Structures are given as structure tokens and as C-alpha cells.
Design a protein around this ligand. Structure first.
Ligand SMILES: *[C@@H]1O[C@H](CO)[C@@H](O[C@@H]2O[C@H](CO)[C@@H](O)[C@H](O)[C@H]2NC(C)=O)[C@H](O)[C@H]1NC(C)=O
Ligand SMILES: *[C@@H]1O[C@H](CO)[C@@H](O[C@@H]2O[C@H](CO)[C@@H](O)[C@H](O)[C@H]2NC(C)=O)[C@H](O)[C@H]1NC(C)=O
Ligand SMILES: *[C@@H]1O[C@H](CO)[C@@H](O[C@@H]2O[C@H](CO)[C@@H](O)[C@H](O)[C@H]2NC(C)=O)[C@H](O)[C@H]1NC(C)=O
Ligand SMILES: *[C@@H]1O[C@H](CO)[C@@H](O[C@@H]2O[C@H](CO)[C@@H](O)[C@H](O)[C@H]2NC(C)=O)[C@H](O)[C@H]1NC(C)=O
Ligand code: NAG
Ligand code: NAG
Ligand code: NAG
Ligand code: NAG
Ligand code: NAG
Ligand code: NAG
Ligand code: NAG
Length: 1178
């Protein structure tokens, strides 16, 4: 019985925590019972170890799954092989294997902060939510790390435990923190996940602008219309002015723009006629998009808010758009498509235009004979209509062209399925919206009589369903693992053994089995009124996280909450990319979502309430329900006149994660209130005009007396009638449903936060508000920072005492002085995750071989000296060194010189041979380097030395940035001396004394250039010359120092070169404590771009960073730092061990003139203490 026997489909990817499910189908020509064993093998260091395995017995004519056990989540990117072996009772039947791609995303995490914009002296409250792939809660140990934009580790929590996946943590910011995008990192299992939140100086806006405009606009349209809605947070309309800039984005023309300035009361309509886009199509061939910018200024405060939208311009009045069409042509089957014909402005299509028929031209070409057919179709009321036309059997390319009233659309389908029997099937879906649990219908059509169909459903690179359907139409029920995109592959085998298949990719909308509903007790409430928030969940023993914030937090255009969009983005992150194969007849159709097939089937009169409490985050609740499905939490409404927006999430062990469908709003509003137009920061002594806006929303115009309370922290400039208080009260008239503004000149006289109490009294109502102004100090801000390294790596000494002093300038503004002291146990280095991307194959020419070779050596030396090198990366690294060493040894000539092309170039380069000697000398503890090659390079470099010691280059260097290091011969001598000066390991008799005398003479005449000076300093520090100290001192004199920063800026990569060379000069002269600002400059010049830029400064920078780590390579740290002195009445103690070695611990000291501290370190290791002084001058 010849024919097909088996068909085994296994996915080509593997993720940790996901079961590798394969599908086995046994056919008519196979025996009764076939035992299928699937093995997973890990290939490390040319050892293949069977990690996971499973076995099963399958019967003839049955389609079942063989499921492997789950991979552990601790695994990494190793070589994985899947081997499938199907056996009979006395003989094997198939035995094959493949490679598997690895995906690093194993679990889901959500970092929810209460807001994304934070003021200084605030508190960040956040939750870490750890879930599985099927959104069940995950219990694990993890680390939380909060860092500044300068990437110093400021806060950390080590080995926290998650109670049902939710971790609630808080973090108090400093008084003056580093402004910018702070980062929260979670190191769960072996993966780091990031979440950025901004810390800046901002004032919360009290209203929002929405701009309702059509997305498209026709050129033949007479008017472009739109609506502007400026609305307060508490729901009242905004009375103000609008400036409207209609600006074409044509870069060919000028900045011509229509401007329209008018008035707005809540909502306002605008329209532009053709005399307002007459400058627009003058400026624009095809027209580009235009920008409509709205600036609304509130007429009582002057606070302006601007929004912008983009409008695309279409040349025709109607747009004809297509969907629901197969991307692969199927011969002898009906092509179906759905057409939306809509107007440009988005309005409904009129009954007059419905009489015009859409002319659709089909063009089937055998790519060269073509068949062209024009069909007329009617248009419905909604404008969405389906077309269906047959396809001829020889058609290879289909061209569709639709015309309607001059509007044209066209596309072409070129992908043709080829079959020897010319038998094809088509799988189509009828439901536009597919959800989880709702069954959806599938229709299978074919040009011939169909056999028993077999369907396989694959989602997230995992085969999640199998089965056999005999009917040509069947219903399938999606599950939670099908999200977001599912492959339904429907196939059957003909009598000659040919597989006939179709693959349908469908988006599956995720529904949640767990539901959480939030209800306020009231829709509208007053401030300081007790309301109740009711939480209703689906299941008991659930943990509920509730956030309820100000609406202006949502109006800050930044949010870090857990919503449906983040869940959809994480589900799209679960989806992966796929690769290609050899495409026998349908294996591309199989591999459309990553499937690898094994088969043989192809062969042959009261005081007002004083409003003081103004928070931005009202409710930050983290509770456990226990036995309750609903709970009522009683809260007090704060004093902010706004709307409070509440959302939340629920986590249960049975159902998983659940989210609120809509945010629920509570309106905190009173009809008579006070608004203070305040900036964030005022300087002390400056007279600023406080703007008090009395908002009256009653039905009558009221005479309001505004009374500001006296304080000793500020002065009111204008006087009052009485002598008890100056500027005590003012009188004004506020209209009904409007606001009025009164100015008060205020001169603050004290630093810090100052309270202002404003009381508005009317015969109808009253209000009182107490608000904080942050008053800073006048003058110009200056910063000083001094760093001291305390070294305890030697076990002879145990206590080290150092002194740090600073004297203030005499023109310092009093009260502006701030003294901080930070202690760290280790420096911030390059991150290992990006540096693993910096290791590569040595390829190309010899200079390209060095470009792909040398940073691998210096990165391997750096993580060898930092003790963070994994074994697989190590074996890959030394494999790269061996192959790069062989590729560089291909380019060695007969005289020992090296070049880019080897023997093809006429003369070799001295600089490239020096680079060869330096890289091969560094690589010699790691790989085996032949000493005759190194001796030949010594003799060829020594043969190019003159009598004075000056060296000369007869060769050529192709690359610019390799030759960009200063072609003057003094740099050549210094580079060849610092490359030849590592050669003392083998023999120590190197006579470069004439060259050292030449470099000392070149230093003695006086150097203007700067890289050259750093190279002379490194050479003289390496030989231990007496002129090295003067050169390093004058190079430190040439350095720019600011903010604990020492660097060199060239007036014309080279800055990193001079910083690393002077750093190695400081290390070789035992001035380790002075290299710390340069080391911080090296730490800061690599944060935004991963590793180090280019290669030539990358090598020297990682050499200096590994040379620091080799000097302080003690893995045990137990350092106690005690800070005493006149500036500290209590001794400040920092404890540094191996866990908090990266923690930048900080402490604040009193202001004593002059500021002097004594820092005593006791223990073992090394520590760095930095004294920072911030002062304002006049
Ligand atoms: C866009 O706004 C303009 C505002 O002028 C509208 O033009 C007016 O339309 C009404 C109703 O047809 C006429 O009675 C007026 O005489 C028109 N005013 C003019 C031309 O200045 C226009 O209809 C609006 N278009 C849309 C699509 O809403
Ligand atoms: C719209 O165009 C006008 C010019 O027709 C711009 O007005 C000038 O703008 C510049 C830059 O702000 C000012 O320096 C001039 O004093 C303005 N003069 C006039 C005559 O208005 C206007 O700024 C444009 N609007 C936008 C937002 O692009
Ligand atoms: C070598 O680097 C130093 C920086 O340390 C350069 O000196 C700076 O020159 C600029 C531009 O005129 C000044 O604004 C700085 O004040 C200087 N800083 C210091 C620390 O002196 C110097 O110019 C560089 N040399 C060359 C040849 O580029
Ligand atoms: C801080 O360090 C200084 C310098 O070590 C200490 O200086 C003292 O100076 C007086 C001068 O008469 C000597 O008599 C002391 O013996 C010194 N003490 C030493 C050397 O430790 C100073 O006392 C230290 N104390 C504080 C808290 O500032
Ligand atoms: C893997 O199989 C086990 C065994 O039943 C099951 O509990 C687990 O949920 C499966 N995991 C996935 C991701 O399907
Ligand atoms: C299994 O491996 C062999 C050896 O390369 C190969 O010839 C064959 O095509 C593979 N597949 C099957 C189904 O035997
Ligand atoms: C703006 O146009 C809409 C659409 O007809 C209309 O309902 C609304 O009243 C208009 N607003 C103003 C202020 O004219
Ligand atoms: C609004 O205007 C200010 C001041 O020019 C500008 O800083 C801000 O970016 C603008 N915002 C928008 C959304 O255009
Ligand atoms: C294609 O559509 C026409 C018109 O409804 C119908 O007669 C024909 O049977 C269809 N063919 C297939 C294969 O569905
Ligand atoms: C479509 O309408 C045009 C114009 O009336 C006519 O010339 C053409 O023959 C029509 N085509 C069909 C298929 O009815
Ligand atoms: C599938 O349906 C056909 C048509 O009725 C029938 O002949 C065949 O036996 C069915 N196969 C199975 C396995 O039910």
C-alpha cells in the first residue's frame, strides 16, 4: 500500500514557560500503533544534553497532540534542537530533528505608577504586577531598582515576594532631585523590565481642549469645518479666546498660515473657504498634510492651552477603500472583497450619488496574456458592500481597479499558489469581531469534492488546537491562549498524496473572565464631603488595586496605568516573526506562522471651610477581598475643584487579571470658589502679581470681598485703609456663571514653602483657600563637587580617614546653601545587555577584522575583571578570538608587517602593526599567540626607527576613524611606544630610551595638541619617567571641571580617547583618587547609546574601566563610612556590602561656614564619597 503515512507538525520557536506542543496525524498507509518520542536537546560547548522529553502512542486515523513538558523560566539563549522519532513495534518509521529559535519574553509584567509627571518633594506610589502567559498571577523573587536620568542607583529592594502577583511600593523623592525621565527597573528571574516616569516642574491645567475635525478634506470641498471644545475639569464651560493657525506643512513653500482669532464659550465652530486654502495649494503634485493648531486662552486667568491636529488632503471627493481580501490568489475559486466608498468629510453618502454605479475592472494576467472585465455595482446606504467574482484557472496576477464619480482606487494581488493537480481550497471567516468564548463560523470552499478536513490552530508560535472536521463549514471556540492572532490551517490529502492546505490569520479580541466594577456614591459632590467608593468583583479571594487621581493628571498627556492598550501591546509583544525555507509546494503556507512539518506526503454668617488639601493622587488602594465579592470604602473628598477619575484592576488565582472597562468620574464642585493663578517657583525678593480669580456659578452677580491673610513670610505691597494690616482686603463684582480677577502684589521674603490664605466673602456664599508657594532664592546657581576614594583593598590597613573642605564665596545668597554627601561602593559601568550585542563575528578586510575583533577583546577583559561573564558568552567570545586571530594571521606578510589586504599592498603600516601587537598582547592570557609573529612585529617596528627615536609610517590605512587619530609623527611615536611597552612580559630588555628622550623633548618644547599630550602622558607614566608628573598635572590644569566632572573638549571620540588615556595615566602614577571625575565622565558618556561609540575610543575606554576593576578586584565588601565634623552634629553612617554596592546613598548636612567633614572608612573593599555643595551667588 504505497502512499502517505504520517504528518507531524512542530513549531519552530520555543519560549520558557510555554509547552512545546507538536501535532501528529497518522494516515491510511501507516501501521496500527506508532510510538512518537519528542526530545529537546540543548547544545552547549559541543555537548548535546537531553533536557526535556515526552512519549505517546498514537493510533491510525487519529489526529492528536504530543505535548512536551514546560521549559523552566531560568533558561537562556542556547542552541535548542527538537528531535522527533516515530517508531513501530519492530522498526523505526521516521527520525528527524531541527533547530529552534529562542524568544526571551516568557512572562508579562506591568508597572503602574499613580501618575507619570511628578513634582519635587513628592511621593511615587507604584505596583509591580507579574503574570504568566495566560495571565494567572506569578509568585517569584525579584529586585526593584529606581534610578535617575544619570542612571545612578538611588533606591533598591532586593528579593521581594509577590502576594498574588501584586507588589505595592512607595518611594519618596528628594527636595531637589535630578529632573528628567527616571527609570523603574524590575529584575525578575533573569530579565530586566523598564518603566520611565518623568520628574519635572509643572503646574496642573484646569481645562482641556478638544479639536473635532475630519481626518480628510477634498480639494473640491468648498468649506473645511470643525469644532473646538474647551472644557474645565469640573464640567463647566470655558469662556475665553481662541487663536487658530491653519498651517500647510509644505517644505517647498514658505510659512504662509491662516490665522483666525475669535471668542469661545464652551464650544465654537470654525470654517475655512477656498480663499483660505488658496495659499495652501499654491504652496503644494500631490498635496501634503496640513496642521491645525488651536491656542485657547482663558479670559480671566490668561492661562493658555494649545492642541494640534493633522488633516490630510485628498484630490477627489470620495475615498474608495478595500478590505477582507485574500493576499494569495487561488485559481478556480471566487475572489471576495469588501468596499467602503465614503465621502472626504466623513458625512453620509447622498441619495443622488447612490444612482451612480461603481465600475470595478478585474484584470487576470498569466504572468503574459490578460483578461479584462468591467462589472457595475450599486452602493448601499452605509457605503459598505461586498464584491465576489470568479477567477480563471490560468490566472497568476489579479489587478482590481474601482472607479466612482472620478474617484479611483487600485491594487494588485501577485502571490499565486501553484499545484500540480490544480486543486485548491479556500478558508474564510464570516465574523468581523472574534472574541474569546464566542464561537465563530468558518466556511471552506473548493473546486473539487472535499475529504475529511483537518484543522490546526496555532497562536503565539504554539500549536494550541487540533482536530478533524468532516463538514465544509464549522464553528470554533477561541480560548485565552489564542490571543492576539490565530492561524487556522485547514488541510487534507488527495489520493496521489498531495497536501492541500490554506492558512487563515485572524485577530482574536481578548475578553477577561474577571470583571471589576467601580461605583461612586454620588456623581456630583462638594469638597470635604464623605462619599463611598464601591468595588464589585467577580470572585472571592482576589486582590484589588484601585487608583483614583485628578483629571489634570490624565490631562498631562502622559499615563503609566494598566489599561487595555498596555495589555494589547503586551499580547502583540508575545507575537513573533518567522523565517523562510525551500518551498516544495505548500511549506510556505505552513511556515506563515512558524510551523515545521514532518511528512512523506509529497512523493509521486459663618466661617467658610478652609481648602488646604490638594493632592494629585487621591486613592491609592491595595486591598484583599477575602470572602467578599464587593466592598464599600468610605473616603473624604479633597479640596481640589476638579473631577476625580477612578480605575482599577483585580487579580484572582482562578480567573487571572481583570480590568475596569471605563474610568469612573466623581465631580468635586461647588458653585462659588477661588482659583489662585500660581507659578511653580518664585524667587525671593521679586514682586510678583498674585492673580486671585473668584469663580461664581450662581444665578446672580455678586459683590465679593477678597481678604488675604497676613503672614511674616511675604509682604503685600499695596496698602489698606486700616493700620492693623496692609493690603488686607479688596472689593470686586463677579458676574453670574463667570469669573473675575483681582491682582495682589506679593513680595516673598522667606525660602521654602509659604502658605497663602485667601477668603472670599459674599452675601450669598463664601470660600477660603490655603495654598503653598515654593519660594526659591535669587541669584545664579553654582555647584561644586569633590570626590574622595577611600581604599581598603589592602588587608594591612583597616581604617582610612580623609578630610573634605569647602569655603563659600563672600557673595553667596544667604539661605541658598545646600550641602549633600553621597557614598557609593562601586561605579556605574556599561550595561551587560547592550555589551552582549557589541560582540560580533570578525569579518571583512584586516581593518574591518580589527573593527570587529578588538572591542570583543576589551569587552571580554572588562567582564573578566568585573566578574559578570557567563559561560556561553565566554565560549562564543574565545571562539571569536580564535577566528579573528586566524583572519588577522591571513594578513601577515613576509617581513612581519600587517596591512588591510596583506601582500597586495606594497608597504605595510607601522600603526596597524602596533595595533596588531597591542591586541595580540592583550589576547595572550585568553588565547594562544605564537611568539614568532610577535617577534617579527617587534623587528619590523624597530627597523622603522630613526636615530633620534622618531618613527615614520610607510603604509596606508583605509578607514577614516582608524586614521582619525592625528597623523602627526609624534602621535605615531607615542602610539608605537604604548603598544611596544606591553612587551615586557616576555623579555624586559626593550631599548626605547631614545624614543622616551624624544617624547620628553617633544613635551619640553611645548604641546598645543591634546590627544598627543594624553598619549605622551600615558607613555611617560608607563615608563615611570620623572616628566610624567608635570605632564599629568598640566593636563589636569587643561581639563574642564564642572559638577564633579573632569573632561577635555576638542575645539576642532577623541574626548573619550583623552579621558581614558589620562585615566590610565592617573592609574599608573598611583593617583587613583583623582581619576574619579574622569571616571564619572566615562560613565556618563555611554548611557544614552548603550556601549561605547565607534571602536578606537571603545577599546581604550574599556581598557581604563577594566584597569580600575583590576586594582579594586576584592569581591568582599563590608565598609562602614562614618561622616563627622562641624557640619554634622551626629555622625552619618553608610553601610556598603556586596548587595548595595551600586547604591548611591545620600545624606544632607547642616550649613556651617566653612563646610568641612571627616570621612572614616572601616572594613574591606573600596568606597567613593562625593561632597556636593549647591549655592546661589548675587
Ligand atoms: C461650514 O460652515 C459654514 C459657515 O459659514 C457653512 O456655510 C453656511 O451654510 C449655511 C447652510 O447651507 C448657509 O445658509 C450659509 O449661507 C453658509 N455660510 C457661508 C457660505 O458663509 C457650511 O455649510 C458648513 N459646512 C459643513 C459641511 O458643515
Ligand atoms: C501666521 O502668519 C503670520 C504672518 O502672516 C505670522 O506672524 C508673524 O509671526 C512672526 C513669528 O511669530 C512674528 O515675529 C511676526 O511679528 C508676526 N507678524 C505678523 C504680521 O503677524 C504668524 O506668527 C503665523 N502664525 C503661526 C503660528 O505660524
Ligand atoms: C584640550 O581640551 C581642553 C578642555 O579641557 C580645551 O580647553 C578648552 O577650550 C575651550 C574653547 O575655547 C574653552 O571654552 C575651555 O574653557 C577650555 N577648557 C579648559 C579645561 O581649558 C583645549 O582647547 C583642548 N585643546 C585643543 C587643541 O583642542
Ligand atoms: C577632623 O580631622 C582633623 C584632621 O585630622 C582633626 O584635626 C585635629 O586637629 C587638632 C589641632 O589642634 C589636633 O589637636 C587633633 O589631634 C586633630 N585630630 C586628628 C588628627 O584626628 C579633627 O579633630 C577631626 N575632627 C572633626 C570631628 O572635625
Ligand atoms: C503545560 O502542561 C501542563 C500540564 O497539564 C499545564 O498545567 C500547563 O498549563 C501547560 N502550559 C501551557 C502554557 O499550556
Ligand atoms: C530527515 O533527515 C534526512 C537526512 O538529511 C533528510 O534527507 C530527510 O529529508 C529528512 N526528512 C524526512 C521526512 O525524512
Ligand atoms: C456647530 O455645528 C453643529 C452641527 O450642526 C451644530 O449642532 C452646533 O450648534 C454648531 N455650534 C455653533 C456654536 O454654532
Ligand atoms: C504650546 O505652546 C508652548 C509655548 O510655545 C510650547 O512650549 C508647547 O510645546 C505647545 N504645545 C503644543 C501641544 O503645541
Ligand atoms: C461564485 O459566485 C457565483 C455567483 O454567486 C456562484 O454562482 C458560484 O457558484 C460561486 N462559485 C464558488 C466556487 O463559490
Ligand atoms: C456599466 O455602465 C456603463 C455606463 O452605463 C455601460 O457602458 C457598461 O456597459 C455597464 N457595464 C455592465 C457590466 O453593465
Ligand atoms: C464524512 O461525510 C461523508 C459524506 O456524508 C461520509 O461519506 C463519510 O463517511 C464521513 N466521514 C466520517 C469520518 O464521518
Amino acid at each position: 500500500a504505497p502512499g502517505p503515512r504520517f504528518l507531524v507538525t512542530a513549531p519552530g520557536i520555543i519560549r520558557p514557560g510555554g509547552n512545546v506542543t507538536i501535532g501528529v496525524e497518522l494516515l491510511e498507509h501507516c501501521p496500527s500503533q506508532v510510538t512518537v518520542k519528542a526530545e529537546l536537546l540543548k547544545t552547549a560547548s559541543n555537548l548535546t544534553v537531553s533536557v526535556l522529553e515526552a512519549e505517546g502512542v498514537f493510533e491510525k486515523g487519529s489526529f492528536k497532540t504530543l505535548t512536551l513538558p514546560s521549559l523552566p523560566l531560568n533558561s537562556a539563549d542556547e542552541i535548542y534542537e527538537l528531535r522527533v522519532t516515530g517508531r513501530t513495534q519492530d522498526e523505526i518509521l521516521f527520525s528527524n530533528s531541527t533547530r529552534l529559535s529562542f524568544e526571551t519574553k516568557r512572562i508579562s509584567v506591568f508597572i503602574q505608577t499613580d501618575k507619570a509627571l511628578y513634582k519635587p518633594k513628592q511621593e511615587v506610589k507604584f505596583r509591580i504586577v507579574t503574570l504568566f502567559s495566560d495571565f494567572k498571577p506569578y509568585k517569584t523573587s525579584l529586585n526593584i531598582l529606581i534610578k535617575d536620568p544619570k542612571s545612578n542607583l538611588i533606591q533598591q529592594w532586593l528579593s521581594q515576594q509577590s502576594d498574588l502577583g501584586v507588589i505595592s511600593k512607595t518611594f519618596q523623592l528628594s527636595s531637589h532631585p535630578i529632573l528628567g525621565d527616571w527609570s523603574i527597573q524590575v529584575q525578575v528571574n533573569d530579565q530586566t523590565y523598564y518603566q520611565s516616569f518623568q520628574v519635572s516642574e509643572y503646574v496642573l491645567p484646569k481645562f482641556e481642549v478638544t479639536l473635532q475635525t475630519p481626518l480628510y478634506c477634498s480639494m473640491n470641498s468648498k468649506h473645511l469645518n470643525g469644532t473646538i471644545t474647551a472644557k474645565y475639569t469640573y464640567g463647566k464651560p470655558v469662556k475665553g479666546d481662541v487663536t487658530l493657525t491653519f498651517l500647510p506643512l509644505s517644505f517647498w513653500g514658505k510659512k504662509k498660515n491662516i490665522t483666525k482669532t475669535f471668542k469661545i464659550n464652551g464650544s465654537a465652530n470654525f470654517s475655512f473657504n477656498d480663499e483660505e486654502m488658496k495659499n495652501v495649494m499654491d504652496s503644494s503634485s500631490s498635496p501634503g498634510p496640513v496642521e491645525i493648531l488651536t491656542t485657547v486662552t482663558e479670559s480671566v486667568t490668561g492661562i493658555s492651552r494649545n492642541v494640534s491636529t493633522n488633516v490630510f488632503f485628498k484630490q477627489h471627493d470620495y475615498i474608495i477603500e478595500f478590505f477582507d481580501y485574500t493576499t494569495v490568489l487561488k485559481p478556480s475559486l471566487n475572489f471576495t472583497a469588501t468596499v467602503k466608498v465614503t465621502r472626504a468629510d466623513g458625512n453620509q453618502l447622498t441619495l443622488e450619488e447612490r444612482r451612480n454605479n461603481v465600475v470595478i475592472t478585474v484584470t487576470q494576467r498569466n504572468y503574459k496574456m490578460e483578461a479584462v472585465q468591467k462589472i457595475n455595482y450599486t452602493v448601499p446606504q452605509s457605503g459598505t458592500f461586498k464584491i465576489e467574482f470568479p477567477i480563471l484557472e490560468d490566472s497568476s496576477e489579479l489587478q482590481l481597479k474601482a472607479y466612482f464619480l472620478g474617484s479611483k482606487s487600485s491594487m494588485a494581488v501577485h502571490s499565486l499558489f501553484k499545484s500540480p493537480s490544480k486543486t485548491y481550497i479556500q478558508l474564510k471567516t464570516r465574523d468581523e469581531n472574534i472574541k474569546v468564548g464566542s464561537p465563530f463560523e468558518l466556511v471552506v470552499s473548493g473546486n473539487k469534492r472535499l475529504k475529511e478536513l483537518s484543522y490546526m490552530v496555532v497562536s503565539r508560535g504554539q500549536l494550541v488546537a487540533v482536530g478533524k472536521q468532516n463538514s465544509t463549514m464549522f464553528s470554533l471556540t477561541p480560548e485565552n491562549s489564542w490571543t492576539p492572532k490565530a492561524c487556522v490551517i485547514v488541510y487534507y490529502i488527495e489520493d496521489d498524496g498531495e497536501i492541500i492546505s490554506d492558512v487563515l490569520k485572524i485577530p482574536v479580541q481578548l475578553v477577561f473572565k474577571n470583571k471589576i466594577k467601580l461605583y461612586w456614591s454620588k456623581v456630583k459632590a462638594e469638597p470635604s464631603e464623605k462619599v463611598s467608593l464601591r468595588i464589585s468583583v467577580t470572585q472571592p479571594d482576589s486582590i484589588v488595586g484601585i487608583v483614583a487621581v485628578d483629571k489634570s493628571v490624565n490631562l498631562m498627556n502622559a499615563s503609566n496605568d494598566i489599561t487595555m492598550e498596555n495589555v494589547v501591546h503586551e499580547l502583540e509583544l508575545y507575537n513573533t516573526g518567522y523565517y523562510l525555507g525551500m518551498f516544495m509546494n505548500s511549506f510556505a503556507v505552513f511556515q506563515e506562522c512558524g510551523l515545521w512539518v514532518l511528512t512523506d506526503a509529497n512523493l509521486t454668617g459663618s466661617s467658610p471651610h478652609v481648602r488646604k488639601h490638594f493632592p494629585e493622587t487621591w486613592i491609592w488602594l491595595d486591598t484583599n477581598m477575602g470572602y467578599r465579592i464587593y466592598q464599600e470604602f468610605e473616603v473624604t473628598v479633597p479640596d481640589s475643584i476638579t473631577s476625580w477619575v477612578a480605575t482599577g484592576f483585580v487579580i484572582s488565582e482562578d480567573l487571572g487579571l481583570g480590568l475596569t472597562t471605563t474610568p469612573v468620574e466623581l465631580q468635586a464642585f461647588q458653585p462659588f470658589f477661588i482659583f489662585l493663578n500660581l507659578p511653580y517657583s518664585v524667587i525671593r525678593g521679586e514682586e510678583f502679581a498674585l492673580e486671585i480669580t473668584i469663580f461664581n456659578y450662581l444665578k446672580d452677580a455678586t459683590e465679593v470681598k477678597v481678604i488675604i491673610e497676613k503672614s511674616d513670610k511675604f509682604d503685600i505691597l499695596m496698602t489698606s485703609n486700616e493700620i492693623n494690616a496692609t493690603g488686607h482686603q479688596q472689593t470686586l463684582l463677579v458676574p453670574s456663571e463667570d469669573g473675575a480677577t483681582v491682582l495682589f502684589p506679593i513680595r516673598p521674603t522667606h525660602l521654602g514653602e509659604i502658605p497663602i490664605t485667601v477668603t472670599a466673602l459674599s452675601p450669598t456664599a463664601s470660600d477660603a483657600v490655603t495654598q503653598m508657594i515654593l519660594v526659591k532664592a535669587e541669584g545664579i546657581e553654582k555647584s561644586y563637587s569633590q570626590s574622595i576614594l577611600l581604599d581598603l583593598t589592602d588587608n594591612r590597613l583597616q581604617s582610612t580617614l580623609k578630610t573634605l573642605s569647602f569655603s563659600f564665596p563672600p557673595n553667596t545668597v544667604t539661605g541658598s546653601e545646600r550641602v549633600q554627601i553621597t557614598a557609593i561602593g562601586d561605579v556605574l559601568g556599561p550595561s551587560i545587555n547592550g555589551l552582549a550585542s557589541l560582540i560580533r563575528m570578525p569579518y571583512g578586510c584586516g581593518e574591518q577584522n580589527m573593527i570587529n575583533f578588538a572591542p570583543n577583546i576589551y569587552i571580554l577583559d572588562y567582564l573578566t575583571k568585573k566578574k559578570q561573564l557567563t559561560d556561553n558568552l565566554k565560549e562564543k567570545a574565545l571562539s571569536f578570538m580564535r577566528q579573528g586571530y586566524q583572519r588577522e594571521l591571513l594578513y601577515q606578510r613576509e617581513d612581519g608587517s600587517f596591512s588591510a589586504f596583506g601582500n597586495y599592498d606594497p608597504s605595510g603600516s607601522t600603526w596597524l602593526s602596533a595595533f596588531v601587537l597591542r591586541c595580540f598582547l592583550e589576547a595572550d592570557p585568553y588565547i594562544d599567540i605564537d611568539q614568532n609573529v610577535l617577534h617579527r612585529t617587534y623587528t619590523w617596528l624597530k627597523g622603522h626607527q630613526k636615530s633620534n627615536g622618531e618613527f615614520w609610517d610607510p603604509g596606508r590605512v583605509i578607514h577614516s576613524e582608524l586614521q582619525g587619530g592625528n597623523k602627526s609623527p609624534v602621535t605615531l611615536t607615542a602610539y608605537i611606544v604604548t603598544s611596544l611597552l606591553g612587551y615586557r612580559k616576555y623579555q624586559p630588555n626593550i631599548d626605547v630610551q631614545e624614543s622616551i628622550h624624544f617624547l620628553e623633548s617633544e613635551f619640553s618644547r611645548g604641546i598645543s595638541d591634546n590627544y598627543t599630550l594624553a598619549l605622551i602622558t600615558y607613555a611617560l607614566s608607563s615608563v615611570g619617567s620623572p616628566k610624567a608628573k608635570e605632564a599629568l598635572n598640566m593636563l589636569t590644569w587643561r581639563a574642564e571641571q564642572e559638577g564633579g566632572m573632569q573632561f577635555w573638549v576638542s575645539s576642532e571620540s577623541l574626548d573619550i580617547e583623552v579621558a581614558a588615556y589620562a585615566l590610565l595615566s592617573h592609574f599608573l602614577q598611583f593617583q587613583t583618587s583623582e581619576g574619579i571625575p574622569i571616571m564619572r565622565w566615562l560613565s556618563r558618556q555611554r548611557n544614552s547609546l548603550g556601549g561605547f561609540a565607534s571602536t578606537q575610543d571603545t577599546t581604550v575606554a574599556l581598557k581604563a574601566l577594566s584597569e580600575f576593576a583590576a586594582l579594586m578586584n576584592t569581591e568582599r565588601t563590608n565598609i562602614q563610612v562614618t561622616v563627622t565634623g562641624p557640619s554634622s552634629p551626629s555622625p552619618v553612617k553608610f553601610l556598603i556590602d556586596t548587595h548595595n554596592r551600586l547604591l548611591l546613598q545620600t545624606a544632607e548636612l547642616a550649613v556651617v561656614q566653612p563646610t568641612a567633614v571627616n570621612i572614616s572608612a572601616n572594613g574591606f573593599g573600596f568606597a567613593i564619597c562625593q561632597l556636593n555643595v549647591v549655592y546661589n551667588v548675587k
